[PDB]
Amino acid sequence: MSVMSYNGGAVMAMKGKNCVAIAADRRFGIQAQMVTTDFQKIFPMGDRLYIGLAGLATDVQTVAQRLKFRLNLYELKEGRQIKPYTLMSMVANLLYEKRFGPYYTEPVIAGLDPKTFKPFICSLDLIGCPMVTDDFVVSGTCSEQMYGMCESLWEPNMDPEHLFETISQAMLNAVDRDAVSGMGVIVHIIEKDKITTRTLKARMD
Amino acid sequence: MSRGSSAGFDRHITIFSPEGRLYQVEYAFKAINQGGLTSVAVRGKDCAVIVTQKKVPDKLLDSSTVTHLFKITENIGCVMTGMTADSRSQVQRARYEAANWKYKYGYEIPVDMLCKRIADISQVYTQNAEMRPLGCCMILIGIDEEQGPQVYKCDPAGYYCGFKATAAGVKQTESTSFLEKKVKKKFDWTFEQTVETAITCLSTVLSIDFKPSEIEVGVVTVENPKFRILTEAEIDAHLVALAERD
Amino acid sequence: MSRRYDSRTTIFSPEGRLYQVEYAMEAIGHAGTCLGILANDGVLLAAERRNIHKLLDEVFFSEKIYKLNEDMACSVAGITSDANVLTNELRLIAQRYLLQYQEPIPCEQLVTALCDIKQAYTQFGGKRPFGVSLLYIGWDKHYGFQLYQSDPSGNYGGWKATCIGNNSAAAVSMLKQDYKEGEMTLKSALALAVKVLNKTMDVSKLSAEKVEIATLTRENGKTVIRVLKQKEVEQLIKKHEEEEAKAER
Amino acid sequence: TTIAGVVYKDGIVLGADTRATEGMVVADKNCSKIHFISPNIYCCGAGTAADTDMTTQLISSNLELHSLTTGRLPRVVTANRMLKQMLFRYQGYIGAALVLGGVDVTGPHLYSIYPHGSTDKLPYVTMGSGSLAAMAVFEDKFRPDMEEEEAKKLVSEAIAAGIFNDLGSGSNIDLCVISKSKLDFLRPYSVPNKKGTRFGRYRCEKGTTAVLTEKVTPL
Amino acid sequence: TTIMAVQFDGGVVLGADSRTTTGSYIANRVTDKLTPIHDHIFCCRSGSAADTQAVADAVTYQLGFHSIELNEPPLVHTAASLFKEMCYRYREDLMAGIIIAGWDPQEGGQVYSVPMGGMMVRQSFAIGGSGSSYIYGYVDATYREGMTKDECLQFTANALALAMERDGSSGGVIRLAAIQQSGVERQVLLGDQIPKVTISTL
Amino acid sequence: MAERGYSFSLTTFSPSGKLVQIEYALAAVAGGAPSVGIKAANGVVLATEKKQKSILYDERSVHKVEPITKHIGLVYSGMGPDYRVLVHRARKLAQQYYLVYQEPIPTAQLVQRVASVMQEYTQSGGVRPFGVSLLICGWNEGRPYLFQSDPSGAYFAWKATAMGKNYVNGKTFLEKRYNEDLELEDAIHTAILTLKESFEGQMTEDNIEVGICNEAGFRRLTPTEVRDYLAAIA
Amino acid sequence: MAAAAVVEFQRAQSLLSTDREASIDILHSIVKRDIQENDEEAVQVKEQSILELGSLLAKTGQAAELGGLLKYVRPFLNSISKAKAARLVRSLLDLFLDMEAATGQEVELCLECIEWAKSEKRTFLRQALEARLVSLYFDTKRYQEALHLGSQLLRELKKMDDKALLVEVQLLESKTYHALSNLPKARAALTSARTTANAIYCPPKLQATLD
Amino acid sequence: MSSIGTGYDLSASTFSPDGRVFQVEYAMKAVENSSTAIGIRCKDGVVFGVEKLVLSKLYEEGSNKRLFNVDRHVGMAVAGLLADARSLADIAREEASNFRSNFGYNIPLKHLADRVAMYVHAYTLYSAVRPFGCSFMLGSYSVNDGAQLYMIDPSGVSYGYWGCAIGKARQAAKTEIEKLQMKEMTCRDVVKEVAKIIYIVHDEVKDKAFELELSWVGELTKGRHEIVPKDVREEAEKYAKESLK
Predict the structure, then answer these.
(1) Cross-chain Cβ contact E62/B70 below 8 Å
(2) Measured between CA atoms, how close is C146 to chain D, in angstroms?
(3) Pick the CATH number of B2-245 from 1.20.1250.20, 3.40.50.2300, 3.60.20.10, 1.10.10.410
(4) Do B95 and E70 touch (CB under 8 A)?
(5) By the 8 A CB rule, do C84 and F155 touch?
(6) Are the CB atoms for B76 and H170 separated by under 8 Å?
(7) Can you tell me whether residue G60 is helix, strand or coil?
(8) CA–CA separation, F33 vs F47, rounded Å?
(9) What is the distance between the terminal CA atoms of chain B, rounded to a whole angstrom?
(10) Among B121, B60, B55, B59, which Cα is nearest to B84's?
(11) How many Å apart are CA G54 and CA G48, to the nearest integer?
(12) Is D73 on the interface with B (CB under 8 A)?
């Protein structure tokens, strides 16, 4: 899921965890180079309608390869009446980037999602075309990876409800936009229940 | 009628037929008998031995050159039984398959794996209408790298399975019957005994008893992985041994 | 090959329609009824599932109805082996068009692309056509709501209410009278759909396993494709029997 | 960068690794699997560049899957050694991967090192990455060419933790992957330290100084 | 990178091989065994850089692997030596180390061939190539006297390998020996710490 | 290859509404040895009887139950030659899916992919339509799967189905004894009953093979275990 | 399982040579390890584990103890969830019938097996147990009791007319019903027997007894 | 055979009830109709002899080539129809040509005979191409086996021969070879003798004249394969005519 460059006018993903919900927060940023004109266009996409995968950088191949991957995820989702596992999709994405051989164009995938029908928490980032990345901790990713990583450690509420994570996250996104050109350009925060997706769109330039 | 009736184009090329197999495929089994070779295969526990009739139809042949025993790899040896036209051709195909593993793997191919790659090959011929199935079968001996001496045979239609004892020939059903009683009564298997069972069974059904230059014995021993030809002096040795058994 | 095994599998007839294609229609007839009916706010497919026996794990959503895309669906009537090759490709083309274009796939577009592959087999190659006639249900932002049929040759015609399977001729005739080109809401449309399965299927008591109705409706500003539940299908059947008794005496 | 080691003991691998993949001392990944389970008797350790290392192992892994299933007899170490050498050299390689290839064939245990070029070689204990030297100094002396297996698990946990703590090529936690010859044993705690973040009192934004902005259903 | 010497005898042949492979500074591989096989009677040693050599060995080994089965008897040495050369003329910008081809053919049972990084295939009474052998490159020719005998040759291949290891920093000090005959290949590992290493300058 | 080749289809429809060769193929699967496959809903068991009739088969390898990969297994019906390609094919597919997903091929997905290749073989010339029926088992994603793949290409997902010798009787027993969502013990017991329905392939332990898929993967069962299940049926 | 090669083999020898008393302790232990059926490494051990339990009786003939040990076997039979279950129970039941440790004890053990077999599972398992239970009831001369249990077999099983165990249960019933001196019943039971007997899946022995 | 009106003898991807294709057998008659090629294995080399029929008196040697030089140590002597002989020649030349160039040593024959026979046979299998209605021999001098001679039939069967004849009087020629010891005899004497068998075969009341092509690969040429030198060629023919009478 290789995208041309990184210049997409914003590149940032943060994922942060609870035991009652898990959240993936994203720039909703679009429009390559410094000049934007828009602040809307899909980037995080529901693929089982309750798991997300985020593909990050320039708009065209980000949307294009996601959709072409969606079709292979779908095949597997379609046939059986139960939908695919997160761990098997996690290597699937790793391989998809790898197919684009040596001296490849850099994407940065972030997968956030609770596992389907074996219930445990999952957060992962891919980048380059790299070794397997299953973690159960926290993951922040992009080219300003260090800046995201800080925030992904920052939100975990192990015992508060879903709501407190959102309000904490709104401040977390904002402070990050003042620190880098990767956050911002409108922010979409996704709190993911297992049975559906809740999309909230945050106020913030 | 049957074995020569149109129902599609299945008495011509491979497609199923009223007989619940394939006519074209069945001629390929019938084809084995024509060649005139009969083989007995015994699996020992120190070697795996195949004895087959070696077709000698001139007196202007050199012994070394004229054989049906072929070296596929330095681990696997075989005998070809059936039509000789088909025999040379299958062996050359196998050889490319053995070699293909040989570079990648970095070691000698298992007897089971050699038989699996060739068996599948004989299936392409069988699946295709572009070519007719092989009139011959290749019966493999070799030291498997942990299971032990192993005898596998792939069909002329290409399916393979493992055997204690096998037979293919002019008389496929009868040799196999003679062979189960030899296994049942268990003399045990050393180098000499297992070779001895194998030759006698080939002699008793057809009711010949051979010269050493009209049977061929080929072994893969655990003396070395390399396949050898025993040659007439050692083949004669085994013939004399058959007397005053069991 | 051989020229004595050739009397030309692929050839043109002077009557203009290939021998193998007419022969394939009889095979379509044999498989169970698959219909599509239009609503003025959706489109739905109603089909009888190939399975009718007790034994069925129910790994597919329905063997006949394939959920291809988030705005397209198709059902098959005919040869199931033949169905698997067309439905898998179909799944890929319909999906690429909604996904990328952000513009919901037209049935008319879809059929022309698939029919090219079907057709190649009938004109040349020494081959033979597909055993299925497929009914596409979808919504596109162009014409609006649509229904399409494709045939073994790669011939299409766009209806708005059509039935294929056994007692096709009778069915379309019934359909002409009650439905023209748009008058039935989503609920009446669904009632009409159960009615056609009823006459044509032998069992007139039906079941949720026996038939499957999947609906496609755009609700709350996104186009929703859903397989209805066994409860929902059963509620529609229970509502339909009361009304069946009253309608025909 | 990375930290990978193997030791030669009674069964094929005792593997030690950090989870983290770092570019110098900055984390790209907090946890990953650097010593991999793809099969359960073929294990592979990784070092250097992440991308180069993953593809070289995966290609061998696919070829191993075929032998394993047909024979119903073990995977072949040699086949794996030869396959990464020819296949990655052909490609000419994006950077370097020090890879530790390992399977028990039919005979004894064989451990191999695919260097930074692309080669098929035979030692018996490998360490891979920029930390190959660092991982080695403990391994070479405590292991004296076969030792008690259980003693090896204590020793190795001790070595692995030493690589993590003294050498900045390893964040988060340390992972050990043990196979006797078809075992899959994973404990990711070969170092004592807190796994993620700690919030005894919960403030990460002052009590509703910001409020929830919109809720939508994307159907 | 490695230390390889292979000396041809009027008897048959003797090999001598490294114990370490070294990269840029750190030693990549701490226990060395080199027998890439093209056939069961003929072997090659991958000298100099491991990678460059190994890929040549590997393409050559696939054709010779095919060939030995095909002929029925195993291949001759000279067949393998032309094939090692065939790759190396093309990929001479990507390989320039040394390939050491030694064993038994079927046309005499007495052949040692050198395919070099500048290319040529010739037979020589002794050759040393690789890392530490280059140091002693003129020298290995110098140390023997032509057509020496099997016992004397055995002490010389051991003694010259020690003297080369001492000389370059690409070898260690353990002499791994291989005696090649009609029999097969038999290999012996003669320890080091106990025997005397060649004199060292003040 | 070194020839012109074929490309004409060997099947032409009928004004019946049938394809002629697949109906001849269906007769060959029935002529096989009994193979049953049941998804219990607590694991999948595939059991077969193999006509060796001499027990001079030193198979510790290939059988009529052969694992495709570590949580897929395959059992066939009919003739052996057609099996040989399908078993190799399946292993290749298992490998293709292993590279990207690295969880070996799922059952719903496998069938579609085999089905497409089987359909070509009918549709094209220089190849012919099989006359083997495969029963595919798998446990992946915390659900057992049982599918049956017909010699045409068609795939149906079953709870319990039969093939091989006297399948008509088998499917009818299967409905009566087995009902949907019964236990792993029932699935195994009826499975062995169908083989016993009519045997006649030498009654020794190495003449029946079962391979079971469950939560921990797929392994084929030792012939001695298989015999114990049989022993109960009179 | 964790040791039906170690512990079980020793127990078998102790049962032949000396008395079951020593063996009571061992019997508990082995059955408890066996409870885990296994489906991925069950292997050779499981096939032996189940076989030895069946073979256990009549290595010292009738005892009070022979009756007693058996109760431990009852939790194992149920738990395993395999086809091989049918075989063990039937065996273990037939042997206690032969070597009576008391009629009372033998009736309790078959009654409990049956109650459990009726709940879910299969028609095949229930039938082996009932032949043991009606026969116990016939000999004791409680003809009335046999009639009750017997009736359960007639109503449900009819559907199947291919069942080999079922001929044996019903002929023991016809005979009991003759003794009871209710003649309609005697014919009724025979009717059920013959319908199922006609099937070609039933041995020459079973076909013979019908007659 | 059969003369069925659809297939079996009209195709060759179809086997008879017994398992044989009639099409290869019809082709097998073709070697019998024209002149013989004899070839005997020595141990210092191989000596080949093909009688080329003077059909027209306005031909010169090199016309209707029955003798090919496969490499510079491999020969091919054919008998039967010359068009199928040419194809077989072309494949053989390329197979021999790659082996000397690449390996650097002389080709062991037994593999080569098997490969070429594989080629013949692969075409038999197919119904889209024909069985080859030529019988041909390959002969070589090697440093791994010494001299080898193999004869491959129109069926694709390979056997090694001490001494072969394929042609219009196999029975008369083979027998003459049996009587003589040429099996391990020196190539020089053999030249005369191979020609003398050709003289018996030939009739002056079924043929007018023939032009002898023999080929050396033996001790005169030092193992190099050349078509017979004009002086030697003549000497050997001269003996053939003189000795009968």
Answers:
(1) no
(2) 23
(3) 3.60.20.10
(4) yes
(5) yes
(6) no
(7) coil
(8) 11
(9) 48
(10) B55
(11) 10
(12) yes
